[PDB]
Nucleic acid binder design. Structure first.
Length: 88
DNA sequence: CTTGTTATCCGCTCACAATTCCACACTAATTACGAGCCGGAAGCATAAAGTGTAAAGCCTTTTTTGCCTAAAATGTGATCTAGATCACATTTATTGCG
């Protein structure tokens, strides 16, 4: 059961380490918060990890749902999320 | 007395929101980690036949330039006849009328 939901979980394919890299930076964020009491700035963790600081920000942009289309916005009658995007 | 079909009743699954535009403002949580593995590509220089580009090297043709000068076009001004100019004063000939 940990093999099937290990890849084909979301509606779209998702890598393995891409979801294992999130909780990796989690069990350390509160680790420095329970001691010092301040938010771990992207400077001290840049020396303990293999990620610089710039490219690591674009990684979070990938980790999403992202979002459906047939979802009410304002009119809640005929207006849909995928009905406001112009065509090229 | 027992049996049937029929009528009334209930809860159930079922089908089923319709006055008409716009503006302003606002918004998201969660599956244990570490070591070892094969994967793609970082873009490396290579090298070749093949291709299409990019110097400017004398030829030929066009086009502006300066040229010469033979032949045709161009002022000199004082005198002199054939031309022109105005305004609005007065005189003239047109077709009819009576």
């Amino acid at each position: 059961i940990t093999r099937s939901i290990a890849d084909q979980a979301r509606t779209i394919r998702i890598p393995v380490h891409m979801i294992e890299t999130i909780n990796k930076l989690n069990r350390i964020s509160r680790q420095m918060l329970q001691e010092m009491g301040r938010e771990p700035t992207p400077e001290e963790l840049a020396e303990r990890m293999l990620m610089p600081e710039d490219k690591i920000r674009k990684v979070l942009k990938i980790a999403k749902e992202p979002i459906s289309m047939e979802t009410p916005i304002g009119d809640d009658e005929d207006s849909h999320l995928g009905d406001f995007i112009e065509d090229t």
